[PDB]
Amino acid sequence: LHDIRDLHRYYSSESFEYSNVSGKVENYNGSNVVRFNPKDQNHQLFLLGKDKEQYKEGLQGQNVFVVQELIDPNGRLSTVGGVTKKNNKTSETNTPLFVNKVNGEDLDASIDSFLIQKEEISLKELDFKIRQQLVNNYGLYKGTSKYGKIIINLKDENKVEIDLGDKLQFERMGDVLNSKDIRGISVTINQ
Amino acid sequence: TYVISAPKIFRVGASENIVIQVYGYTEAFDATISIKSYPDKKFSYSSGHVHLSSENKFQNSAILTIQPKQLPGGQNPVSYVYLEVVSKHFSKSKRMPITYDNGFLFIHTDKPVYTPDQSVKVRVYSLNDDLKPAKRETVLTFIDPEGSEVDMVEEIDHIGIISFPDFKIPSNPRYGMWTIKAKYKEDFSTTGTAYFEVKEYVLPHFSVSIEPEYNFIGYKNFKNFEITIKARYFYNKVVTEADVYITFGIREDLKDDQKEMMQTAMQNTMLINGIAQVTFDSETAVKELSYYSLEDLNNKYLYIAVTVIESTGGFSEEAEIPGIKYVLSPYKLNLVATPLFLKPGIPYPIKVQVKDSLDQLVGGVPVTLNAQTIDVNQETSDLDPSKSVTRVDDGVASFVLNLPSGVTVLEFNVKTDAPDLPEENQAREGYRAIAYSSLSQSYLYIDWTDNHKALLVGEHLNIIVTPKSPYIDKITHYNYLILSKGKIIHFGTREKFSDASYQSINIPVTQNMVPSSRLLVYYIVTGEQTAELVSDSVWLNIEEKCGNQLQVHLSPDADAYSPGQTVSLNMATGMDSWVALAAVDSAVYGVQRGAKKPLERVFQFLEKSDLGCGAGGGLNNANVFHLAGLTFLTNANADDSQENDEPCKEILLQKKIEEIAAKYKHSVVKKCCYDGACVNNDETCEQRAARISLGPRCIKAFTECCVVASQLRANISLGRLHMKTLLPVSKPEIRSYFPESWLWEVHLVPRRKQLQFALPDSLTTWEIQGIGISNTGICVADTVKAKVFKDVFLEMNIPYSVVRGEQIQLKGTVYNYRTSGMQFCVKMSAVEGICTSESKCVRQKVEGSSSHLVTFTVLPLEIGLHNINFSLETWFGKEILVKTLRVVPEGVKRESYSGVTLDPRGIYGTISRRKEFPYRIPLDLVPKTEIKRILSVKGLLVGEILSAVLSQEGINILTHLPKGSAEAELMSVVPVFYVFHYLETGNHWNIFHSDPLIEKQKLKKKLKEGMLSIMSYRNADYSYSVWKGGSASTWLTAFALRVLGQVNKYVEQNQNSICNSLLWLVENYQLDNGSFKENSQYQPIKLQGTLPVEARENSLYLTAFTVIGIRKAFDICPLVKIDTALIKADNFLLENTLPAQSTFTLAISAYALSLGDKTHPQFRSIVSALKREALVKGNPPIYRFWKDNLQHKDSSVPNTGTARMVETTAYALLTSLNLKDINYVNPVIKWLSEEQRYGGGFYSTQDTINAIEGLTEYSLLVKQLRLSMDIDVSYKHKGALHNYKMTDKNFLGRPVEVLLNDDLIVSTGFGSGLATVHVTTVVHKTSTSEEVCSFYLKIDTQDIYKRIVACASYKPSREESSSGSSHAVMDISLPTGISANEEDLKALVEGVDQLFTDYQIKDGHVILQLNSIPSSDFLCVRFRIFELFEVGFLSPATFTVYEYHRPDKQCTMFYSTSNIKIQKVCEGAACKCVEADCGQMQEELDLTISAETRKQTACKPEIAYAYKVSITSITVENVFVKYKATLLDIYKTGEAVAEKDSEITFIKKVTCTNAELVKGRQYLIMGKEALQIKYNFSFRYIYPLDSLTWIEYWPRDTTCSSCQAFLANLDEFAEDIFLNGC
């Protein structure tokens, strides 16, 4: 969908997370669509990850990192992925995580950290906090800052990347991750 | 080339940051690092596969991390490891030291000063190397002010706010500087430390203030310093005459409990009208008086402390100023981010920075800068001096000198040129700078500017890289490197601008840099010969921005609150966080809360993990990297770090006696002379010297200095004379209390949380602080003071107790705190049994921000009766305060000997299903006073001892016995220990209907807090000692061991202590026969015998006793050396008992062996001896016990038990109980479990522990017996009182006060088990004449104001030695409202001449304790007493003196504190009430001794006037109403309307047969003001005419029935009042 102004507005938003929520499927168009009464309105949730083809049945009280992607006037908000196990262990890992700013021949790098507050964590939620942090502490989405690649480590030979040039990853936002597995994140920003 | 940076040290559990970055060509290439162990590259704890490339500019990072491996204690493990890196192109590693310090321990005691018995709140904030929660298990260990441990405890770390258990300050603690240390349970050397000070609270008599000329001393004054002290009572009325004693002293600091006082510290400038002053010539007052001869030599403290003793009452009040810094120069220079190394060709900068003696910045000071230099050519240069001036906004005075390339070392001095500062006191500093030596001729210089003292996070640092010099410019890239909190966090590379020299590097300041950081910047220079790394570096101080902004707020943000207001408090954070509230009485800190900082307190500390040092920049690329905090890994330059490592530190007439200290040769002799002269006129010098024990070494020091000061008092000097030489003896007293803290809860605040509550009813400024910790780190928030307070309020001072028909004066003061004054009107509520002046709204005026005395006279006839409502009225307030009045009778004996053992099943020798306790009224009973008596029925022989520990909280003594001894502190742990022992060792925990596991926690506790209680009496050598600071007693050491050994079963006691405590007796105090000598003079028992016999006996008694102790406790320190001793000891006893001298002696001897080998033939002999000695009641034995004597069978067992009786028989019972002698013992315990009194062991202490142990240990040895009686308590003639089914469910039922006047009858059904009935009956008698006097007494009140002189002599019992008593106490009841002279008594016990060893004023009783009361003659205490209030027909208190361990020796005597006669008649009380309170007309004529009584009866604040007048109207006619008189002259203006000449009436009704004013005569009048009935259609005021009005004839007779000598004084008094004012 691509742009610099927007990517600074969506990832600065108010995130939310929920649990004990069980529901029963209905397909809006393609394959799915859901809803839940949070205590103040009535939301919606779009399942369409590779993990959804295993869950066209419904939700048994899972954890849903419900951050809004778009909204209806009644306060209900559409969202994609973000679901996790529940009972979700309240583990708290302090993960390595680097950040190198490219400026052609220049590089302002910094070693840092990320706090994973769970046992299993949704790549949506993983990506939302991985960018929320860059936006507020590494000059992301403000000027020449908008292109780059997040290399999550997971084992000696694996990595899950996320272009920063666009948030077009609706379908893997279903993918889920083992907290203790992640060896160390490493970002590189090209301005 | 490659560069691989990393810290100078590693840390275990530490995520060690290691950048790698390199100049390799295009070919990307892998890079793995890891941690490997000294010379064998075998162990590799961790590593990292971090692959650089031209994409990552060939730079990367890894979190290695050395966890726990080598754990062997002793092996010097871990010392040194190997850093390693790996690639395709090279491999390299390093030997570099490491450490066990990981993280930070932060000890948050709630407040920093405590008083005996407060409970220290505590928690610990703990972080790791990464300033994150750091969960771990931690362990602290409180350390008394003498540096022995005293406790310990670990706890689990759920979040980072470890919450420990409160630490109760001892009843009578070791006063002074406490220390709490804390260490990580597991591995990690990291240390926390904290402190608190335990000071001894004392009640203040009157506010003494002390204010110093200024807050520092500076050259200006130093020949003088106007110290003004100002004394005043709480009743808004300044002290008048007073005696002032100010003593000074130097001081290193304000964490120094000690400070070298100084002789010739001015005495007496007698306070006078609320002020005195003296200036203090510091020059004089230090020179010969210390190492301090130049003021120069002195930038430490001056200590001031006054003692203001009130002249009238004779009270006393102390006050101090901790310190007052001395100052040479009122500014202080310190360089500011100006590195001490010169790069050459670059001009060297030198920003100095001036500050005042208060550490604020001060601008506009001129500052000269002389500097000095030598060439590399070894030539010097004496620079020309420059001067600049200190900026205004900056505080900085910036220089720059341009340095000849060939410069090397520059040396600079820097000073202020204050034009009005004299040269001396100008402020100066010196520094030295040295050149970055580099043979490439190459150097580097980086700087940056920003106009403010702190880089705000979010800002962007433009920093100027000037490579100047390097023979060449072939620079490829500049590379930087930024550390913070011991860790590299950023690193990078800017391409060098091919053309020009310098460019800028722009680093964002990041939140990771937050407390500070350093950066270092290097280019790699290819000299033709060898590759040169080169770099400089700079320390970057940045803003104390938090990670989690926690901010607390009060709901009503108002700056003052109501004492009770409900009010919501709010938490705040930008990220979910842990909080941690606390609400301290802000007053602790208070007095100049030194600026320093609040949240910087932590930041300062928490960033000494900054490994680096200096303002920046090294000396070699090494050094540069070194001071950075780094050592690096780069083959080219020597990454070296010259040996060891850089302990860096802050580069980034009484004087005539006082000369006779000339006999110093030990401290104790100082004290010897010092308190030697003190002030003792009731006995000779050598009478006092006699009582001296400490050592004939100081006896001279005593008699010498004493005579010196005795003849002197004849020469320095009404009859007021009182020598002195102050020295608080270095005791931390503290005349102000500080309330327990609150809101000490943790909380989980996700960005918000609000938690209402109403704050405590109390005048306190609650500073409510609140730190928080979360994944960002630690962030203390800006405090939030919340003073509560009520505008105007009254307090009434009720006494402890008053006797029936004593007329009492009930004072109080009413508090105005409003800025303006106002009108009140306090009225007291007539409660049924209390007489009063109303059949009233006496509205007064309170001056603003002050207080008006109030008073009432009352007089109760109904005993015990309580309750009096008090009220006051103000325009906008009407408030009611309730109070309750203890009323009593006269001379109190309680006779308890009644009891039964309910035995329905005859187990014990017969069937007990009834005992009748009847009325027996002793013909000495005080009229109209009922006979109280209590009934305490319980199952189990061990049931009193159970009810006592599980019905009252907090450990408690089991008698009325006074707390002075260490012995009383020990005896407190006892009843819990035995209870817990019987509870646990016979599993009975199922007694509890409740949760037993937690009822058990409680007792472990009670047991511990009580165990520490004793520590104050633990000496330094591990020897305990009878009273505090008293010479080690061999005796109490044993007994302490005994009780310690005992409690070790269930609460482990410190082994090492117990060893040395044990090793003390045996190595020093066991004679070459195996017997034990007592050290101190403490006589514990008085034994019978001849002077020789006694010593023999006495010896057994100790040796037996001290065995039982070592024996009792031996098990925690079985120690070859002390097993021998135990035997050599045991030996003596076998070899030295058996021609038995006393049954008592025998019995201990017996019980003591009993605890060893109980088959030595000889032992069996002794047990024979003993067993033969016993006696029995009824045939067969139903009761057995032993008598103290030995076969001398006077047989006076006069229907009465005895401390020693119960003692010895417990020793038999205990011996027997050992030899499972089961049957023998039954009738023995039948008689104990029917001896012990309601609650616990009645007779004294020492038996009671044994008898308890017995009772327990036997109920343990013999099986229990399921209780199931059906008791019935009932009045013989009156209807049935209660009657209840007893069972193992409840047996420790309620007591019951038997009300009615009838014979009582306990009377169980058939059933089963064993229930102990005791019935402890109290009565008051009018006389002692009956009783048996074991002490000769005398007492009376002397005038030479007034003072008590009590004496005693010990009457020896037949067979007894002439030496005099055993440890004994005298106990003086004080008459109602007659305070004793605390200081006088302190005088007696507190000196080497100590007459007593322990005083205390509890509940209206002065209570003295000493080791003996010689029969040779009398022994006299004397002390003075001040009529606290007006009592009117007071009944006498009592002067009783018994022997501590044998209370059977109670000589008791009534006495009175006044001779005042005067008659009445009075029937059943309706007499002293028909006379409300009404006034008194002093007798006609008057006796000499009155110019003092006449004045005083004036300004005494209850005197709202004093004015002479004459009756112009007392209507002779009958039925006509009250007085009215014409005023003649006003001495004290009544607070009411009318002025000199006017008439003012006087009102009173009802029969008052006690004063008749004669019309036409001029009576002088004195009392409170007149009562305003303000208005309900217009009128007046006038007065009461009460019991302290001095209505008194003014016989202006000038010649009548020959008058006189009474007019000389009223004419005297007269022209005396107005002038002396008041």
Ligand SMILES: *[C@@H]1O[C@H](CO)[C@@H](O[C@@H]2O[C@H](CO)[C@@H](O)[C@H](O)[C@H]2NC(C)=O)[C@H](O)[C@H]1NC(C)=O
């Ligand atoms: C002064 O004392 C009286 C007597 O105790 C108090 O009377 C009580 O007031 C409360 C509140 O109304 C009642 O519940 C009680 O029953 C009253 N006691 C009795 C039996 O009279 C009175 O409150 C006190 N004065 C004030 C204003 O507190």
Ligand SMILES: *[C@@H]1O[C@H](CO)[C@@H](O)[C@H](O)[C@H]1NC(C)=O
């Ligand atoms: C005390 O005695 C000295 C020496 O006899 C005498 O001179 C002096 O007057 C006396 N002191 C005073 C002030 O009375």
